[PDB]
Design a protein around this ligand. Structure first.
Ligand SMILES: NS(=O)(=O)c1ccc(NC(=O)Nc2ccc(C(F)(F)F)cc2)cc1
Ligand SMILES: [Cl-]
Ligand SMILES: [Zn+2]
Length: 260
């Protein structure tokens, strides 16, 4: 609540700049996507999402989200095309969500907040490892996908099923043989802009690719997210909800759209 960065009144996003002054930088994320200002760019290529050989490893409650990690030693699950130059390897995905269904997303669309947001995090292979990539202005690409409540997303259910085994900070479980293709919406139409990580260290090295089409997840799926805990085992129970950073100033940036 004050012993480490987080999302509460005493350690949340308004405090982060003290340890990470780039929090007040020129290319911070998330942002509000004003759909009427975004520019259709007919020269953007279709996004290429190649996840058929993805090799998942573990699922972890890291005290700020839950995250599924992948083997990124080789080009297995990669993102290419769109605004990207070269090849970006999938490292991990995680979510941000709310306490109620009208908040939880980091990006907004014409100020609209979604119930949650999925981030599929990739790094640029030209830098050899993620640690080096994190120091570059084009080191990372994050594919952001909004979640709204509707019918269940079948490809999310194996994630939901394991959450009770990682309730508290520091717990992990085996999470091999998970196929992230099951998390995507039908359309790959997107907005893109240059930004940052949305958690410390807030590094300004991300090409954001935010899909226009949300996925629908069921009420029961989101309720299971909201049973996770921020705290470690034995500490006062603080439900892991509202683990989202609000929109940051756009400053000197243009958001581009892949679609008219
Ligand atoms: N919310 S967001 O999508 O903007 C976002 C925020 C923070 C990160 N940070 C990392 O993935 N860091 C990282 C992972 C993994 C490793 C490894 F263990 F592999 F070296 C070393 C660093 C990514 C994305
Ligand atoms: Cl604390
Ligand atoms: Zn994220």
């Amino acid at each position: 609540m004050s012993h480490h960065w987080g999302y509460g009144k005493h350690n949340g996003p308004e405090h982060w700049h003290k340890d990470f002054p780039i929090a007040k930088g020129e290319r911070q994320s998330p942002v509000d996507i004003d759909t009427h200002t975004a520019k259709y760019d007919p020269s953007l290529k279709p996004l290429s999402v190649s996840y058929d050989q993805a090799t998942s490893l573990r699922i972890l409650n890291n005290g700020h989200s839950f995250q599924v990690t992948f083997d990124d030693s080789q080009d297995k699950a990669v993102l290419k095309g769109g605004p990207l130059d070269g090849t970006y390897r999938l490292l991990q995905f995680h979510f941000h969500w709310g306490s109620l269904d009208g908040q939880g997303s980091e990006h907004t669309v014409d100020k609209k907040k979604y119930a949650a947001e999925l981030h599929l995090v990739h790094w640029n292979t030209k830098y050899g490892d993620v640690d080096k990539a994190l120091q570059q202005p084009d080191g990372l690409a994050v594919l952001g996908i909004f979640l709204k409540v509707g019918s269940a997303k079948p490809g999310l259910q194996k994630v939901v099923d394991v959450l009770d085994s990682i309730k508290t900070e520091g717990k992990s479980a085996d999470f091999t043989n998970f196929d992230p293709r099951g998390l995507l919406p039908e359309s790959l139409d997107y907005w893109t802009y240059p930004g940052s990580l949305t958690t410390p260290p807030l590094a300004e090295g991300v090409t954001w690719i935010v899909l226009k089409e949300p996925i629908s997840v069921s009420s029961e799926q989101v309720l299971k997210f909201r049973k996770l805990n921020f705290n470690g085992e034995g500490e006062p129970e603080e439900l892991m909800v509202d683990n989202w950073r609000p929109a940051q100033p756009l400053k000197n940036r243009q958001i581009k759209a892949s679609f008219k």
